[PDB]
Amino acid sequence: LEKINEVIRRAWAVPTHGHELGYSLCNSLRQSGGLDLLMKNCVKPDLQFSSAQLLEQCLTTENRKHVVDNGLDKVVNVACVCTKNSNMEHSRVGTGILEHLFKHSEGTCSDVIRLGGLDAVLFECRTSDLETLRHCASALANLSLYGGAENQEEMILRKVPMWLFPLAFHNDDNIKYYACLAIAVLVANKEIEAEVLKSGCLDLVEPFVTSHDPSAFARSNLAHAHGQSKHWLKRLVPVLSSNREEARNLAAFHFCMEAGIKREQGNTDIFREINAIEALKNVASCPNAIASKFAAQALRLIG
Numbered sequence: 095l096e097k098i099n100e101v102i103r104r105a106w107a108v109p110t111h112g113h114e115l116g117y118s119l120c121n122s123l124r125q126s127g128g129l130d131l132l133m134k135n136c137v138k139p140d141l142q143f144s145s146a147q148l149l150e151q152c153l154t155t156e157n158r159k160h161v162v163d164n165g166l167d168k169v170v171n172v173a174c175v176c177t178k179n180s181n182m183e184h185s186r187v188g189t190g191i192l193e194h195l196f197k198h199s200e201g202t203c204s205d206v207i208r209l210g211g212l213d214a215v216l217f218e219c220r221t222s223d224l225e226t227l228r229h230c231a232s233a234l235a236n237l238s239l240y241g242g243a244e245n246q247e248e249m250i251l252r253k254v255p256m257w258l259f260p261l262a263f264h265n266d267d268n269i270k271y272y273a274c275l276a277i278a279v280l281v282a283n284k285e286i287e288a289e290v291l292k293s294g295c296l297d298l299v300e301p302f303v304t305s306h307d308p309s310a311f312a313r314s315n316l317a318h319a320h321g322q323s324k325h326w327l328k329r330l331v332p333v334l335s336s337n338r339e340e341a342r343n344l345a346a347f348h349f350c351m352e353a354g355i356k357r358e359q360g361n362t363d364i365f366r367e368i369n370a371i372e373a374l375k376n377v378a379s380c381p382n383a384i385a386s387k388f389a390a391q392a393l394r395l396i397g
C-alpha cells in the first residue's frame with residue numbers, strides 16, 4: 095500500500111523523533127495483523143514488490159523477531175527475487191531486506207545464508223548503484239556482528255573479506271564506513287586478521303575518524319540518522335577493547351556518534367543496559383589519544 099509506505103518513510107525521516115515514531119508505527123503494523131499480511135503477500139507475484147518495499151522499512155528489532163518466528167523463508171525469498179529483477183528500485187529493496195535480517199541472531203544468520211541471502215548480497219556487491227552498495231556494506235557489517243563463530247567459517251570459505259576490501263576503498267563515506275566496521279569486527283578472528291592486515295584497509299580508519307565530525311556524519315544518511323539498536327551496539331562493545339588499535343578507534347568513533355544521537359532522543363539509558371559505560375570509561379583514560387577523546391566525548395554526551 096502506497097499510503098502506509100509513505101507514512102512510515104515520512105515518520106523515519108523526522109530528525110530526532112523519527113526513531114520513536116517509526117518504532118511505534120512498525121509495532122502497530124505487527125499488532126494489527128498487517129505484518130502477517132505482508133509476509134503472506136510477499137509470495138504472490140503481483141504483490142511481491144509492493145510488499146517487499148514496505149517490509150524493508152519495517153524490519154525493526156521486534157518485527158525482525160516476528161518474521162523469524164512466522165515466515166523467514168518467505169521474506170528471504172522475496173528479497174532474493176528482488177535482487178534478480180532488472181530494476182535498481184528492486185535491487186535496493188532486496189538488499190535492504192537482507193541487511194536487516196542479519197540483525198537478529200547467530201542462528202538466523204545461518205538460516206539466511208542457508209536460504210541464499212548471503213549469495214544475493216555478494217552478487218549485488220558487484221553493482222555500481224550507490225544505494226545498493228550501501229545496503230551491501232551494512233549487511234556484511236551486521237552479519238559480522240551477529241553471525242558468531244559458527245558463521246565465521248562460512249564467511250571465510252566464501253571469501254567475504256575479499257568482497258569487503260573493495261567496499262572499504264570506495265569513495266562513498268557510507269560504503270567505506272560500514273565496510274570498515276565489518277573489517278574491524280572480523281579482525282578478532284585471527285584467521286581473518288592476516289588477510290585484513292595484508293589488505294591495509296585498517297589504514298583507512300585514522301583518516302576517516304579525524305576528518306569526519308561524528309554528529310555531521312550522523313546526518314549524512316537518513317537510513318542511519320537514528321543510529322543502531324541497543325542490541326547492535328551491545329555486540330559492538332567488545333570492539334572497544336579490540337586487539338587492533340585501528341578497530342578500537344572506529345568503535346570509539348561510532349559510540350561517540352551514537353551518544354550524540356541517543357542524547358537528542360533522550361535514550362542514553364541504553365548504554366548502561368548494554369554495559370558500555372565501563373567499556374567507554376576504560377577507553378576514556380587509556381593512552382590511545384584518538385580512541386580516548388572519542389570515548390570521553392561519548393560519556394559527556396551520555397551525561
Ligand SMILES: NC(=O)c1ccc[n+]([C@@H]2O[C@H](COP(=O)(O)O)[C@@H](O)[C@H]2O)c1
Nearest residue numbers: 106150151152153154317318319320321
Ligand atoms: N535506524 C535508522 O536510522 C533508520 C532510519 C530509517 C528507517 N529505518 C528502518 O528501521 C529498520 C531497522 O531497524 P534498526 O535501524 O533499529 O536496526 C529498517 O526497516 C529500516 O528501514 C531505520
Ligand code: NA
Nearest residue numbers: 112113320321
Ligand atoms: Na530507529
Ligand code: NA
Nearest residue numbers: 312315318319
Ligand atoms: Na546518518
